[PDB]
Amino acid sequence: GMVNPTVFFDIAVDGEPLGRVSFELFADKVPKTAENFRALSTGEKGFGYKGSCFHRIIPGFMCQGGDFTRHNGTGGKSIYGEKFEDENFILKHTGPGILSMANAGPNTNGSQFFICTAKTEWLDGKHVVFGKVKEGMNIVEAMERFGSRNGKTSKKITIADCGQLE
């Protein structure tokens, strides 16, 4: 098949570089959802993840980001001009490193996503799994040091740079 995209985020903590996380995007199974995240990671539509933050980090559960429009957790937009359907639920939340869509209910995908730091089988069938951490899961674990039970972060955890690896 066509090669699944790999993208990266360079993470910073109050501006100080933390490290790089890369992700495989399962475009073979969820092409529309993978393409949204891929395009937002390169910035090629003129907007995207660069400069945005992980606004909710719950240690032992997940790190959530994707609000590049309002920078407060209520924003973000897809590349499609509106929130889009749950493409399918073929892939499951099998363990740490899973990349899955945050939503406000069925068929409300925009640009927000979370990286699981545990198996979250109770999300299967309600959040579209579309990728997985390749390298840098230790960086995601380091990110959890700035989370809290309610998810508010203690420092600004930013996607200082991002793109698509070749």
């Binding site: 909710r56 719950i58 559960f61 997940m62 309002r70 957790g73 209520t74 924003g75 973000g76 929130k83 899955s100 945050a102 939503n103 406000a104 209910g105 409300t108 925009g110 927000q112 979370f114 979250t120 109770w122 999300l123 309600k126 959040h127 998810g151």
Partner: peptide, 17 residues
């Protein structure tokens, strides 16, 4: 429009029950 994209957190809280 703004949207509270937090349903997975509510599901986590339910699993914590």
């Amino acid at each position: 429009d703004p949207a509270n994209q937090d349903c997975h957190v509510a599901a986590w809280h339910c699993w914590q029950r």
